[PDB]
Amino acid sequence: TMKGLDIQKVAGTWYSLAMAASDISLLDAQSAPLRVYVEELKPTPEGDLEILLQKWENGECAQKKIIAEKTKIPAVFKIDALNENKVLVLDTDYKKYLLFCMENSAEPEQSLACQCLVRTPEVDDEALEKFDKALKALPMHIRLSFNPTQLEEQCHI
Amino acid sequence: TMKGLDIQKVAGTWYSLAMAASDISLLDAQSAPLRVYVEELKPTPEGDLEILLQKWENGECAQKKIIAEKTKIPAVFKIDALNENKVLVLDTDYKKYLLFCMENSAEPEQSLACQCLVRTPEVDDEALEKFDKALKALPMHIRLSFNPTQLEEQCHI
Numbered sequence: 274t275m276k277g278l279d280i281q282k283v284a285g286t287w288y289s290l291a292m293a294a295s296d297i298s299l300l301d302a303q304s305a306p307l308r309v310y311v312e313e314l315k316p317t318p319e320g321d322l323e324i325l326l327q328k329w330e331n332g333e334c335a336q337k338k339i340i341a342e343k344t345k346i347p348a349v350f351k352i353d354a355l356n357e358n359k360v361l362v363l364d365t366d367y368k369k370y371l372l373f374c375m376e377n378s379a380e381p382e383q384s385l386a387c388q389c390l391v392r393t394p395e396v397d398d399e400a401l402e403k404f405d406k407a408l409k410a411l412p413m414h415i416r417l418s419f420n421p422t423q424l425e426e427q428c429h430i
Numbered sequence: 431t432m433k434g435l436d437i438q439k440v441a442g443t444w445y446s447l448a449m450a451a452s453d454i455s456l457l458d459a460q461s462a463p464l465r466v467y468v469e470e471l472k473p474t475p476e477g478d479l480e481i482l483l484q485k486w487e488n489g490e491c492a493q494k495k496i497i498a499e500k501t502k503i504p505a506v507f508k509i510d511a512l513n514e515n516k517v518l519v520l521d522t523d524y525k526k527y528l529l530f531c532m533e534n535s536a537e538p539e540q541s542l543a544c545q546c547l548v549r550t551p552e553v554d555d556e557a558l559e560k561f562d563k564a565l566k567a568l569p570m571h572i573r574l575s576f577n578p579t580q581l582e583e584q585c586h587i
């Protein structure tokens with residue numbers, strides 16, 4: 274988990290370039306439970322974190338606003354959404370990429386999903402290498418990526 | 431492509447441990463067109479290669495045989511497959527792992543799919559690292575990894 278995280282500097286728009294998870298079924302279908310496309314991060318003054326993302330539901334992408342609550346580890350947040358209860362920030366440079374995981378701490382290998390976010394819509398090979406470097410110590414069995422045209426196509430339905 | 435490959439040596443039982451493809455839709459469900467699980471390679475006296483595999487098609491785990499005809503490259507075979515034209519053997523050591531891709535000469539990008547095969551139904555980190563470096567240049571938007579108790583389950587789950 275990240276040390277020295279300044280949550281306020283992650284604010285603004287983001288794109289889901291890649292995602293990976295501990296169980297194939299968490300991401301394989303367009304309707305899979307952790308297939309989510311992050312659009313905005315909105316930190317609060319108190320230091321909580323609003324996550325704005327799109328999820329497929331009943332034929333259409335739908336916006337979800339997930340309130341991530343501050344905890345005693347600065348880069349760990351508590352949630353009650355998507356059947357997860359934690360959001361972990363692994364690393365970011367604030368201006369280019371951000372790596373975050375979600376999991377259900379009660380069954381982590383059934384529930385862990387990590388994403389590589391980028392600030393701009395392009396395939397950033399260096400951000401992906403950082404992502405893959407973070408992932409090799411995690412029990413991932415599926416990894417997906419989306420170029421900018423593919424990402425927009427996910428909700429162009 | 432591997433060079434000085436000895437087809438007779440690859441004969442015998444194998445298990446599909448990991449899979450990767452250019453297009454998510456080639457592998458993202460059991461029903462997906464290139465989700466195949468290889469059971470046995472059967473080299474012919476004539477230098478061809480019969481490939482036995484399972485494929486979940488309707489409600490079944492269909493058993494399927496594909497005949498891969500020799501070409502004037504020892505590591506490339508012609509098939510008419512699922513909708514693929516070639517099987518390319520990239521690397522092997524006969525008794526641990528074998529790496530192969532399938533593609534269509536007509537439109538390879540929307541058709542490339544590769545697999546890491548192992549002889550024992552064990553997760554083998556060394557085979558998987560060979561696979562990853564074999565593929566680090568290719569634009570694969572889906573990569574899948576199976577566990578020990580999927581390796582021997584019919585159509586892996």
Ligand SMILES: [Zn+2]
Nearest residue numbers: 319321342343
């Ligand atoms: Zn709060």
Ligand SMILES: [Zn+2]
Nearest residue numbers: 380381382383
């Ligand atoms: Zn468990």
Ligand SMILES: [Zn+2]
Nearest residue numbers: 396397398399
């Ligand atoms: Zn590149």
Ligand SMILES: [Zn+2]
Nearest residue numbers: 412413414577
């Ligand atoms: Zn595992």
Ligand SMILES: [Zn+2]
Nearest residue numbers: 332333429430
């Ligand atoms: Zn629509």
Ligand SMILES: [Zn+2]
Nearest residue numbers: 476478499500
């Ligand atoms: Zn022949």
